[PDB]
Design a binder for this molecule. Structure first.
Ligand SMILES: [Mn+2]
Ligand SMILES: [Mn+2]
Lengths: 125, 118
């Protein structure tokens, strides 16, 4: 049996900028940096978004953008606030459709989504 | 405030094969049916939509938590499907890494963040 999600891992060109994205958009909390170690060549950081473990490692960006995406849940009341946060970070986004979502990209062609709706709502529609 | 994970969406060339992988490896259950399908892995909403496979493989990955006592079983599930799988490192704090048919890397992992932080 699958107990739940363990972690999601993203490879990014610039660990510092990705840190600012995860902190700026999701209020991610940095819990680990391999840079606190002596002679570790590879560079990684671990973050928590609530109880979600996100790991980032420095490497190459995704070649192309695609519609593979990871979506986090927010409340409908915070939709404009979150669109603002994405704005202040200077991130590319998909246009807001006329549940609702904000889709944006980090600096390495990963797509993320902030979605106000639920599965139950989605299936009933 | 982020309330939690909403869903994860994968683009795949063949929804029937992806269905078999999700059900076969993760015990995913289908709740909605070129087009999209929806699954739950426990309370994790997964959406799959027909389209183009990732040009390239990378080490970006999604990892699911399993118990160490189930490790051999899960490795046999991935193998039974003919999925491209990294031979498990003889070990704990263990992982199984595999690609589906569309260059998405997945991981089954027996350890926790807390343990890893040690
Ligand atoms: Mn989505
Ligand atoms: Mn991993």
């Amino acid at each position: 049996m699958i107990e739940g999600l363990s972690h999601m891992t993203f490879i990014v060109r610039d660990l510092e900028r990705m840190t600012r994205i995860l902190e700026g958009v999701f209020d991610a909390r940095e819990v680990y940096a391999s840079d606190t170690e002596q002679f570790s060549l590879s560079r990684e950081k671990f973050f928590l978004i609530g109880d979600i473990w996100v790991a980032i490692m420095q490497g190459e960006k995704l070649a192309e953008r695609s519609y593979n995406h990871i979506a986090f849940k927010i409340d409908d009341a915070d939709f404009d606030r979150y669109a603002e946060r994405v704005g202040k970070l200077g991130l590319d986004m998909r246009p807001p459709r006329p549940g609702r979502s904000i889709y944006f990209y980090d600096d390495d062609n990963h797509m993320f989504e902030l979605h106000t709706g639920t599965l139950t709502e989605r299936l009933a529609r």
